[PDB]
Amino acid sequence: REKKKILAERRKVLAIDHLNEDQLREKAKELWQSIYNLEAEKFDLQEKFKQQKYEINVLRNRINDNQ
């Protein structure tokens, strides 16, 4: 019985629990491309993060070696 939970799990009812099956067949796809594009952004945001750990590890050496 949480206010933010009852409303969060209610965005499904208003978005799917209301109409057609051929709207559904052409909506569950659009609801899946949105995920592949969102797990691609997450992939590149991971490879970019690994790379920054190196730039900082190198920069952390330069600020010291040049002291």
């Binding site: 190196y54 730039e55 590890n57 190198v58 952390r60 050496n61 330069r62 070696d65 040049n66």
Partner: protein, 156 residues
Amino acid sequence: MDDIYKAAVEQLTEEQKNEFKAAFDIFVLGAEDGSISTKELGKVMRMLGQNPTPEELQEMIDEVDEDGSGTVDFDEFLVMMVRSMGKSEEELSDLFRMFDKNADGYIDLEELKIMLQATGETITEDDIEELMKDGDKNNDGRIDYDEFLEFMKGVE
């Protein structure tokens, strides 16, 4: 960026080292010591489209004055003529990692030595001796990020 200019001087066609040697004997028509000084450089700069300052005149000669005489002789003149005929610091950083295989932040010898053997060319023992100390300008045994830049300035 220096020892990149002696590589153009080393590979000048002798058909070019005639035109420059000729244009040098004219350059010095009037000099006592037979070499380009501030007087002869004043002439061919303003009589080419400038009017440089005599304190700035000596700053174009002292850049190739590997003799400290204030005069640009012939061998100092080709080094002047190759400075007037590279690679970005952002691009040399993504390449700096492919050297750093252990991903520490340096390039010890065994990481340079392996990049050299991958070039397909025939490598010697003396090549890796001069090269390692062309970058390791403090003899710590590795080429940190700043050194790897002054190392590869202008390397196409």
